[PDB]
């Protein structure tokens, strides 16, 4: 519980309904319940999990940045700090929830390179979101946990996936942003985004029209970042 009494198939069906209704907190709760059933998530189901929590934490992160900026300008009593801390704590709780699903037991049960890479990329992302708000005796350990998860995902993806695979591309995109704005390694960020882009372009000739659209969509995002950074 609270989703333990609902059939796995019903949870997946409701997650898809919640997405259509733009009810992403509901969507995430249904996907948490589906994960906790203990069976594989398909490609489609992994996408549902990722999209649900992306939207939940995305709203929290946007709110945190607004409040953090107001707080910085104020430095009115304790209210701005208090409310920023409230949002921050709720954000950290969502990150901890996702990382707990990954560690218990999505990753160890991922018997595919493509499933394992998907989950390790998520682990990197949610440690990175923790790093965005960290300012404590563990910001350094959080940053190292993100890098480690991303690096392992990169190692597997380069061995087992073509350079145009959209999960591989989205992983490199996010690891590059990690380097630029979390790790203070803008040269690493630029190197990764550039090699990833070029190696995808060189592989496009192997793809169908549909796969080509998939890959070029993420290539556009790599290009946008390089255009910002160089």
């Amino acid at each position: 519980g609270a989703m333990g009494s609902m059939e796995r198939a019903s949870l997946i069906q409701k997650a898809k309904l919640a997405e259509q209704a733009e009810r992403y907190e509901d969507m995430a709760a249904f996907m948490k319940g589906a994960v906790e059933k203990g069976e594989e998530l398909s490609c489609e189901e992994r996408n549902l999990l990722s999209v649900a929590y992306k939207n939940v934490v995305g709203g929290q992160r946007a709110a945190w940045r607004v409040l953090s900026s107001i707080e910085q300008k104020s430095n009115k009593g304790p209210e701005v700090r208090e409310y920023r801390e409230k949002v921050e704590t709720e954000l950290q709780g969502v990150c901890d929830t996702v990382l707990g699903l990954l560690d218990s037991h999505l990753i160890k049960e991922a018997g595919d390179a493509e499933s394992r890479v998907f989950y390790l990329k998520m682990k990197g992302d949610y440690y990175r979101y923790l790093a965005e708000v960290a300012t404590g005796d563990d910001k350094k350990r959080i940053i190292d946990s993100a890098r480690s998860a991303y690096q392992e995902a990169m190692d597997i993806s380069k061995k087992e996936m073509p350079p145009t695979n959209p999960i591989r591309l989205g992983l490199a995109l996010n690891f590059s942003v990690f380097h630029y704005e979390i790790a203070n390694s803008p040269e690493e960020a630029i190197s990764l985004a550039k090699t990833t882009f070029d190696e995808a372009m060189a592989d496009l000739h192997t793809l169908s029209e549909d796969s080509y659209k998939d890959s070029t969509l993420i290539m556009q995002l790599l290009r946008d970042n390089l255009t910002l950074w160089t």
Binding site: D125, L173, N174, V177, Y180, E181, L221, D224, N225, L228, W229
Partner: peptide
């Protein structure tokens, strides 16, 4: 513009 992820 904000970087993309």
């Amino acid at each position: 513009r904000r970087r993309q992820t």
